[PDB]
Design a protein around this ligand. Structure first.
Ligand SMILES: CCCCCCCCCCCCCCCC(=O)O
Ligand SMILES: CCCCCCCCCCCCCCCC(=O)O
Lengths: 250, 269, 238, 41, 269, 238, 238, 41, 41
């Protein structure tokens, strides 16, 4: 059946029993950078399993009032195994991420998550005049929550309706998107390839994409149901190739 | 090149359930009106022409309007060359993250003859030098500085009253595409300029009057129109519902998802 | 030299002109093209892809997430009332104007094709119910009874494992291209969702379930006359 | 007509006669083929 | 026509020592990144286009700006025709000792309508005669002298408000190349004019108004832009770091080799 | 005559235009071309050829000859300190901006290719030492320890009979063409020279030896977008 | 570039010019053409089709329906008088100027061809009579006697079951194209209808029967020089 | 295109499509061939 | 001449050399063929 799925990228494996078809990012499977499309002359470091494995990020509780969360990849993968180590020790890096968001909910739970990988989701500042610091959008440890309404200050505009990029969140399905509907789905897998203008880019200054998990239907459970419904992102970079060995950047 | 024709359909009671799909899959249903309902054989001579990104960007739109005067820095117009200055073409270009387009600039310049106490002196036809300084190149500080000597900088040297100047520009981005959206900082420390301002630094456009001076102040308006051609859109994005606030960042004021209607059941007319 | 007579269209900057122009930098080595996934060679591709529509765009709810949420309940009250109702035309309808097909419609003046609205039941897994999603072609009043909606084009959505029924509006038009701008001549029909059966839920499941409508373009869909979008209004220099 | 009067490739008319289209990048991005005439699961 | 592709490399412990070369030989090492380090197979679609001397000189740059008036020697502009008058194209041409280029002059002329007490009289379209007197030819002394009769001297007779005048000039040097740098005296006694002034004596350019007179003074600025084409650069030279001081000699004021940095180890950012 | 419609680019002087123009002197017999040695058909040829770079461009030393001289010594002091450090990008780096590749780079806006820095030990013939010349790709801090430089791309220069090791920067970039102008996005790496071993000299040889760095372009090197050079500034008429 | 000499007709907007112009919306998908019945590829087709002419355009009757009605009667009085008389030229003749051929004639300056006037007897079925419908070529006075009309081209209309006789004016002209505007040189003939026999009616049938004249164009008919119609006068902005 | 509309050779478009290059004049001017994979001496 | 210099079909000269004509749509619209040389009835 299509509901069952098993992804064995690297050492870590993910097995699911209610998971719809995995959304290959824009219909193209990730692969190593070809010689035709390569602009860096350094020898590419290609750990097939050291870095191309499923990294389980911090699980965030999907509350009833939770408007959404976002992870900024690949910067959200800092301090996460040898992928983060290679990020630190390389000037240029390319990876195709097969994000797998796990939301285990019972048959009595009402809710739906748009798990969408937005390539280059330029976030808007809460105050348009200024620019937010890096901490406001970076997702090194915890997902950055979209606010239900407008916020102010030197932060990221977290209005869920505008998805933080001045863009209609309902139209976010234009990007590689999968829906975790607790009626049917408990996990969404998006195999997003390396998406950038330059064939390889630095993994700190530039975030290749943002995984936005937007609860369009808020979690609705009657009393007695599990209140701590976790939204666990398990992202596995695929065909990760790095050029430009350098001093570790911290 | 026409769109797919509506295949003839009929009554059906089967297990195919074409209407029944799953958005949980993330795959938009490929169903046709023949699938859900019963449709006649309609040959769709309609074509997805003028909806092509090549045709959609074919419509030339303004990207830079500035007023530079004749007889300081107000005698020539400086443009940090970006599509984002004007919202009309910016949202078109912001429909896609990466667009590899050869951009066809068509400068439209109209002299204003600023209202003054004395305007009885007629100046000959005003020639206009639209110089392009590549990023990192010598930026002029005066209307008669050495930078205006176009040893390498392209310049139309358009004269007023003729056909509007037009110099097609190739794909000049250092990367393999123009990143209209770039959620990345300028510096690897993740501190600096966040947004398209980092990667989309394609130089500057300095517009001046080739005429040295005029008896009376004349403030010609340079209206730069950017026509993308040979476009390669690569990552589609939704239009920005919120009005554009900054031309160097995506910063926005919150806006409603749509025009609110009185009720979920409110259908006008 | 060669005798050339200038046409009355000479020395003009037509915006939609396929005129070759001298290169700014001749023989410029453009950066080699790479296969960036998702190459958009037509924006009807981004129209075709699903987009959550703000069906419940009642005042205030457009700011929040409840604009897309179509509320359904396990209550006998208002069961003979539509779950929702709005205009089919994505150009000017409040629900469909800012969606992917609508946003790629208000960039044009004429639109033709079958809008397909994928309806996702975002409720309890044991919440089973039958809805009647009906496109009524124009020329008659907006359906005020479920029978009236049944008289038009309609699909019964039996909510189950698939949890998504696609109501494909079968382009019931008197002209080859409906006009994106609001005009009664090319005015589209009315898309109304009703309860064919109540949303039966177990005692442990919430009654107030949610539905998401995904208005998407079919292969028939096309736009013919480009126009500046009314949504993007620029008060002044940025 | 279609004759290019300028040597540079960018200095040519827009390719407005190209109507190539692959909606499957966005509408059908799933790894496993999904046929409308079968349950999506 | 693309540049050489980076061939794939691997680990190596051999006696080839590709990195170890000798600058004492005067031969710049032909090594590639695959030689010194380990590189992936990168197909370099990058091409050395726009870096060709033909393309580099293709960018037309000003070489002569002068103001000649309507209604003495100030009514016409005299140009000892040399690329060295304007520093922008001069340094480009001074990248090579000898350049055999067919030079494409594109005169850009803009009337100024000098600010005076009375400027209420409108003069018709001003025609401009850009006459070229070959070296040793008759040099006009007045705006209406007999020299302006162009029996043999080429002249565009450009009219204002039209497309900028452009008359391609062939390779007219008496030698087989234009000696941009010529460390030689005019006379065999090694006394006289030292520099390019000796060999690069290509005549004069006299620019005047074909209109006899105007009711009010109009000082049109002749901006001569030289576009070298069919260039044959033959002896490369470095760019002149020092600013240009004289247009008839290479005489210069001493300038630093580069922008000084705080320390030999000072790396910004 | 022939109906001709003027394009919106008519009657303009584009600087980079391949437009044929009438000859000033028609049928002019150009002086016959002779094979003058060194025919430059591309200025990337003059970029490829070596050029002594002003590594030691400390204040005052740019006026003298010590700008190119990279000082090395047979002293234990400051052995854990770089022999030199500067930015890799020839466009804006103080060391590499006025060199042959840099001067032919600031005439352009985009540059791509492998800079190769040939390092010539201009010291005693019996002065033998090992250096560690390292290009560190950007994204991290400038190497402050020899280990940090070793973590990036590097070559150990064993000074000997050849006396010239070529550190070829292997074009470690995230874009096909780095930008000549100073921008953090296309900011290049950092070229730093350290002591892998001291410059051991006999008692009769000077300790303060000198090194010359020759930044040269490889076959990969190319420039894409021409621009007026910022170095050549003309205050007024000459 | 290419040496082009502008003809003295350059930069002019000639109204009747076959000059190609840049498309406002390039590659615009026009709505597919359908076979709408009645495709007019020439307005001489609408001239050829019959048109009731206002023969009895006496003052006041143009407002009513009696303008087209040609009155005939079963009375001995005025039997030696024409049933009607008017000028043949549809361009300026009061009767034929606003008819289908005439309206498609005053849009032109020159006209050539055979006008055919179909005369329909709109009277009692038992009302039988013989008329003499005569086109007299110009150069002579308007026929004042039935013999004079008989001397010119004429057809005897025996009113019967067919009830419609076509008087085809056989293009009796001295020039290949008569001029639509009123000029004596290309002045056409005179079409006059008389009584060859009285309109005999039974006692139970009305004596004052009616006749309708249908001026139509034959296959010969053509117009050569287009001109703005004098009928359509616009006093000001609508 | 590439058609020359003027009789004089100099009155033609610049040869911007010629990318001939011989760096060996400057980078490798030595009489004896120097191979990078051998000591330069 | 007849060469179309613009890609769009509408951006072409008027088809003034087409003199196709079918008056039978208006002059002879009857279902049963009517010949002039026979009574119309
Ligand atoms: C006057 C002749 C030269 C004209 C040069 C002006 C145009 C420069 C190139 C513009 C590139 C596209 C716009 C910026 C990048 C983007 O945001 O898409
Ligand atoms: C107006 C028609 C004739 C135009 C003649 C003007 C140009 C004369 C030839 C210039 C030769 C090249 C410039 C001087 C030599 C050099 O220093 O390279």
């Amino acid at each position: 059946s299509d509901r069952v799925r098993s992804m064995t990228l690297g050492n870590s494996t993910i097995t699911t029993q209610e998971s719809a078809n995995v959304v290959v990012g824009y219909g193209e499977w990730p692969s190593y950078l070809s010689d035709k499309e390569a602009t860096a002359e350094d020898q590419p470091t290609q750990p097939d399993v050291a870095t191309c494995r499923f990294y389980t990020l911090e699980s965030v509780q999907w509350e009833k009032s939770s408007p959404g969360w976002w992870w900024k990849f690949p910067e959200a993968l800092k301090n996460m195994g040898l992928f983060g180590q290679n990020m630190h020790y390389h000037y240029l890096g390319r990876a195709g991420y097969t994000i797998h968001v796990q939301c285990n909910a019972s048959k009595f739970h009402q809710g739906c998550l748009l798990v969408v990988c937005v390539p280059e989701a330029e976030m808007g500042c809460a105050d348009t005049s200024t620019t937010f610091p890096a901490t406001e959008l970076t997702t090194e440890e915890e997902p950055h929550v979209f606010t239900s309404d407008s916020i102010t200050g030197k932060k990221v505009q977290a209005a869920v309706c505008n998805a933080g990029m001045g863009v209609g969140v309902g139209n976010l399905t234009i990007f590689p998107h999968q829906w975790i509907n607790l009626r049917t789905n408990n996990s969404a897998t998006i195999v997003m390839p390396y998406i950038n203008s330059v064939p390889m880019d630095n993994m700190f200054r530039h975030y290749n994409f943002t995984l936005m998990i937007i609860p369009f239907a808020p979690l609705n459970f009657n009393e007695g149901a599990t209140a701590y419904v976790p939204v666990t992102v398990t992202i596995a970079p695929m065909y990760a190739e790095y050029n430009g060995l350098r001093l570790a950047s911290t | 090149r026409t769109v797919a024709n509506t295949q003839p359909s009929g009554p059906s009671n089967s297990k195919e359930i074409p209407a029944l799909t799953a958005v949980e899959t993330g795959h938009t249903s490929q169903v046709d009106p023949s699938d859900t309902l019963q449709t006649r054989h309609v040959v769709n001579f309609h074509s997805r022409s003028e909806s092509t990104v090549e045709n959609f960007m074919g419509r030339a739109a303004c990207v830079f309007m500035d007023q530079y005067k004749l007889n300081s820095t107000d005698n020539f117009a400086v443009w940090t060359i970006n599509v984002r200055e004007m919202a009309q073409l910016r949202r078109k270009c912001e429909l896609f993250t990466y667009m590899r387009f050869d951009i066809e600039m068509t400068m439209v310049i109209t002299s204003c003859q600023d209202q003054g106490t004395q305007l009885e002196q007629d100046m000959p036809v005003l020639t206009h030098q639209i110089m392009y300084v590549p990023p990192g190149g010598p930026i002029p500080a005066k209307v008669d500085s050495y930078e205006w000597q176009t040893s390498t900088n392209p310049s139309v040297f358009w004269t007023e009253g003729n056909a509007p100047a037009r110099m097609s520009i190739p794909f000049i981005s250092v990367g393999n595409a123009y990143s209209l959206f770039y959620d990345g900082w300028s510096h690897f420390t993740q501190d600096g300029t966040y947004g398209y301002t980092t990667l989309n630094a394609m130089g500057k456009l300095f517009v001046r009057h080739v005429n040295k001076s005029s008896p009376h102040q004349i403030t010609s308006t340079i209206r730069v129109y950017f026509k993308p051609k040979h476009i390669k859109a690569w990552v589609p994005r939704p239009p920005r519902l919120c009005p554009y606030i900054n031309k160097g960042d995506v910063n926005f004021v919150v806006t409603e998802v749509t025009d609110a209607r009185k009720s979920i059941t409110d259908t006008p007319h | 030299g060669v005798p050339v007579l200038n046409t009355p269209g000479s020395t003009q900057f037509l915006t939609s002109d396929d005129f070759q122009s001298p290169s700014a930098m001749p023989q410029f080595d453009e950066t080699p093209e790479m296969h960036i996934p998702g190459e958009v060679r037509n924006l009807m591709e981004m129209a075709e892809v699903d987009s959550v529509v703000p069906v419940n765009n009642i005042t205030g709810k457009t700011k929040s997430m409840e604009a897309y949420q179509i509320a359904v309940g396990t209550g006998n009250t208002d069961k003979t009332k539509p779950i929702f109702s709005f205009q089919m035309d994505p150009g000017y309808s409040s629900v469909l104007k800012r969606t992917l097909l609508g946003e790629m419609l208000n960039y044009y003046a004429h639109w033709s094709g079958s809008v397909k609205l994928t309806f996702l039941f975002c409720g309890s897994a044991m919440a089973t119910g039958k809805l009647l999603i009906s496109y009524s072609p124009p020329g008659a009043s907006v359906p005020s009874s479920r029978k009236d909606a049944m008289l038009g084009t309609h699909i019964i959505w039996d909510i189950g494992l698939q949890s998504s029924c696609v109501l494909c509006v079968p382009w019931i038009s008197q002209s080859h291209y409906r006009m994106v701008q609001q005009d009664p001549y090319t005015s589209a029909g009315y898309i109304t969702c009703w309860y064919q059966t109540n949303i039966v839920v177990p005692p442990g499941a919430p009654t107030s379930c949610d539905v998401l409508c995904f208005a998407s373009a079919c292969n028939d869909f096309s736009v013919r006359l480009l126009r500046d979008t009314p949504f993007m209004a620029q008060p002044g220099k940025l | 007509t279609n004759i290019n009067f300028y040597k540079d490739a960018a200095s040519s008319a827009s390719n407005r006669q190209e109507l190539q289209q692959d909606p499957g990048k966005f509408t059908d991005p799933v790894k496993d083929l999904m046929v409308k005439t079968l349950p999506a699961l």
